[PDB]
Amino acid sequence: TEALYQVGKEFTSKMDLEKPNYIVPDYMPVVYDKLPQPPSHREAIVNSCVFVHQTLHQANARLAKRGGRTMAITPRHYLDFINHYANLFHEKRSELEEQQMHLNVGLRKIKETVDQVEELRRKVNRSTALLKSLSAERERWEKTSETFKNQMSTIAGDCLLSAAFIAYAGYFDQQMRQNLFTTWSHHLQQANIQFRTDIARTEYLSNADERLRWQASSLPADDLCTENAIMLKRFNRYPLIIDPSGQAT
């Protein structure tokens, strides 16, 4: 557990996982040599990562007890999980920042159009409509910027959950995948890590175009098939498909 904690911390050091406003909850002990008694946000995230790994061993052992049919978990799985976490976090933060700067550019452009309207007045009937629509768009975009601010804080836990699902929750049926996801979610809640409540993995990890292409390429519409397709798209270790039929092939 100390080795997993150390390697997770060293690999997640590059990622910006610092939230000064993060308030330390009680309990949630996984690593028994946590550097501070009150852990920081980054250290709490690394503790959540090592917990994900340990609880995957726990789930595998309990599956072996209740009917066998288990695959062993290796540190390569942990490294793949951390790599997925890093790449997904970077991608989502990059898209969020790009959308924010696009919104700012649009703000400057609409302000220039406001200047044009002001110069043109100096018909009034159309001008009143232009000004009221301008005001409405103003508060709409102010709330857009604020909800982007709110979404930014939530990116850390969501990418952790999604990476744990992509890397770890394979070979596992729907019930076990959901049980693992809800256990990780409960751990993040007990660690007071802000992740988006009741998120669905599929749309957060796939676009409408990607899903449309998958359906057009003979993919079943079941949720399990959608998650499997997501894994088949965002892979680091080359996939191994266990398909009794030939639908996946």
Partner: protein, 450 residues
């Protein structure tokens, strides 16, 4: 590891999705809106806001004709308002969707149970090969082409109707290709599934365990003749049922009872069974039938099959097996509900012939049949030629006694895996029930036992 294997929960989820798509399209649309709230909704909101951006830099802030930008601005306002209403309503919508899913969950659990009981019928006999597509066809038939769903629209009686015809269609479609002595076994399995499904009725797990294995517990020490009318093996059966808490006082009751002897010698004792089980609360018909079934297993085990039939009637509805009693009507089975991809496999008990059925059906449906004997190599050649010619036109090629050459059935199954140009084309394979018939062919075709 990317696993595509279907399981209990995968089928439960798929069934729930399909039934919530068909029965409650509005709830499914609310689901889709909820899933696009996190995804596509803000995406195309951004796309239309960008559209307003290029409209703005195209009009250059024009004022003489302001409606060109006013229409776009009000469209953005309307979409933003709609998204605001949806996001503000996420919790009510999600709790309503959860309640609706809870309303439709027992159906999905029952469907997964029915498939995995049907899939596990391989142990009973080698001929019971069923694919996933077979059960999905059963489900698609019970959803859309259900004659009992044409009038009812109350969304609460419709669920009970769907479940009832689901069980009935599953039995009818499986038992038509299943031995007669196995009909009662499948009916009991379905009755247990529905007993688990139904609400307000105890599981009776202890009684089921006693009924299956509990009579075989070791109770040699303590066997006494009781009354002279009760024989020694019936006495030990009494002992094993006295192990069960419900039937603790059988011995005292049978000394107390004086009309028990004539019932023990009754022609059909199952029709009128004395009340023996001790329970304060008057049991529901199902529990009463359970107690009666346990007693029939104890006293007069020769009436076990008919008592099981009466249990199937009391649990799965009276005349649940009545479809089997009436003569088999295969014209509807081949005219519809059977794709030309699936060949109709005619399996018959050794010493019986089944080609007369397809012959007089073709007479009833005035259709040409290319009947071909398969024994000779020229038989192989002419069968292949007939298939190749009939897929082009739609002739009903019927092979006979085809169990003789399993390798050619490898080839035939692989060939029929490829699609058929003509929809009206049908294929019939008459064969004997022997363990050398391809399992893949049995799984890929509809099996009829004669």
């Amino acid at each position: 590891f990317v696993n595509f294997t279907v399981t209990r929960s995968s089928l439960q989820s798929q069934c729930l999705n399909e039934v919530l798509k068909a029965e409650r399209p509005d709830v499914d649309e609310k689901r889709s809106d909820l899933l696009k709230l996190q995804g596509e909704f803000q995406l195309r909101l951004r796309q239309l806001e960008k559209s307003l951006l290029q409209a703005l830099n195209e009009v250059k802030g024009r004022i003489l004709d302001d409606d060109t930008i006013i229409t776009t601005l009000e469209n953005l306002k309307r979409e933003a308002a709609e998204v605001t209403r949806k996001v503000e309503e996420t919790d009510i919508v999600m709790q309503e969707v959860e309640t609706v899913s809870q309303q439709y969950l027992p159906l999905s659990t029952a469907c997964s149970s029915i498939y995995f009981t049907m899939e596990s019928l391989k142990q009973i006999h080698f001929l019971y090969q069923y694919s996933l597509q077979f059960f999905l066809d059963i489900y698609h038939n019970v959803l859309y082409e259900n004659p009992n769903l044409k009038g009812v629209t109350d969304h609460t009686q419709r669920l009970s109707i769907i479940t009832k015809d689901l069980f009935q269609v599953a039995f009818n479609r499986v038992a038509r290709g299943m031995l007669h002595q196995d009909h009662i076994t499948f009916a009991m399995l379905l009755a247990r599934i529905k007993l688990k499904g139904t609400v307000g009725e105890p599981t009776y797990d202890a009684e089921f365990q006693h009924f299956l294995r509990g009579n075989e517990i070791v109770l040699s020490a303590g066997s006494t003749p009781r009354i002279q009318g009760l024989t020694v093996e019936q006495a030990e059966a009494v002992v094993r049922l006295s192990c069960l808490p419900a039937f603790k006082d059988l011995i005292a009751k049978v000394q107390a009872d004086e009309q028990f002897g004539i019932w023990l010698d009754s022609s059909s004792p199952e029709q009128t069974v004395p009340y023996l089980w001790s329970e304060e609360t008057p049991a529901t018909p199902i529990g009463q039938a359970i107690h009666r079934l346990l007693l029939i297993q104890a006293f007069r085990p020769d009436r076990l099959l008919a008592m099981a039939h009466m249990f199937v009637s009391t649990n799965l509805g009276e005349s649940f097996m009545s479809i089997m009693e009436q003569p088999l009507d295969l014209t509807h089975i081949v005219g519809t509900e059977v794709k030309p991809n699936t060949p109709v496999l005619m399996c018959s008990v050794p010493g019986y012939d089944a080609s007369g059925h397809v012959e007089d059906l073709a007479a009833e449906q005035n259709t040409q049949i290319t009947s071909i004997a398969i024994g000779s190599a020229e038989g192989f050649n002419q069968a292949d030629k007939a298939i190749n010619t009939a897929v082009k036109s739609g002739r009903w090629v019927m092979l006979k006694n085809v169990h003789l050459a399993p390798g050619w059935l490898m080839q035939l199954e692989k060939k029929l895996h490829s699609l058929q140009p003509h929809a009206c084309f049908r294929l019939f394979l008459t064969m004997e029930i022997n363990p050398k018939v391809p399992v893949n062919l049995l799984r890929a075709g509809r099996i009829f036992v004669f």
